Amino acid sequence: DLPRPSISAEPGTVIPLGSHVTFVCRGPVGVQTFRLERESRSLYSDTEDVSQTSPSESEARFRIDSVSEGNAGPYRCIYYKPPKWSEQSDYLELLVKEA
Amino acid sequence: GEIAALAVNAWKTTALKNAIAAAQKAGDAAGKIAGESKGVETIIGILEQYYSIYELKGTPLKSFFATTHYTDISNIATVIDTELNTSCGLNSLANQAICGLRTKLGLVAKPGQVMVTQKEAITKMITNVVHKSEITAEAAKTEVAATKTAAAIKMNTEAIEA
């Protein structure tokens, strides 16, 4: 019933140490909460700060201001549209460059 | 001197009436102290043993409960709620000791189930932990206040017979 969310990164998945990255979760309109999960599934961030790109879509952003190698790893989206959590996005592997 | 004796005997009666008052106020003081320290020691013991937590608000439990009362369910839960959101998120690598609570409390998102709100889950936990702590604190205050009152009213009574 609920379409899988999709995940993308801005500017990309390979980030100079100390600089920033933003993940985008995209999902259907009427999403309540977007959750960006890491591989350890106690680490995750929620947001209700939803925006729309198209009438039948909604989305939210997660900015990491200063990346370290402990940020490196898998990242996934899942969203909540009452009464149901969707299923999980594909993973996006974030990597940290030295320079 | 019959009236001499009745004077000391009315003096001993006032002493004994005062002693009773003394022995209850001394008992209650000691019960308060024993209580607001079994509480602290019970809540710390519970966080450390059942939940593997040894700090809050980025201080050790010892120091934390010196500045926020172990009964303050609202601010304990708010502290946990906040520390969970700003140390188990995306935007730091700081201190991930506490994050296990989300697994324990059942917050991890399960595709196919309803949403468990973080803060409600924490306040259910903290209410349970604080109720437990207040009850053991009350037992400590009950024992210690009784043991001190008994000893005081005894000691004073025998003093009032010399």
From TrEMBL, chain B:
Name under which the protein is recorded: Rifin
Species for this entry: Plasmodium falciparum (isolate 3D7)
Transmembrane in keyword set: yes
Keyword Transmembrane set for record: yes
Biological process terms in GO annotation: antigenic variation
Disulfide-linked positions: C88-C99
Full protein stretch here: 157 to 318 of 367
Alphabetic keyword roster: Membrane, Transmembrane, Transmembrane helix
Gene Ontology cellular component annotations, sorted alphabetically: host cell plasma membrane
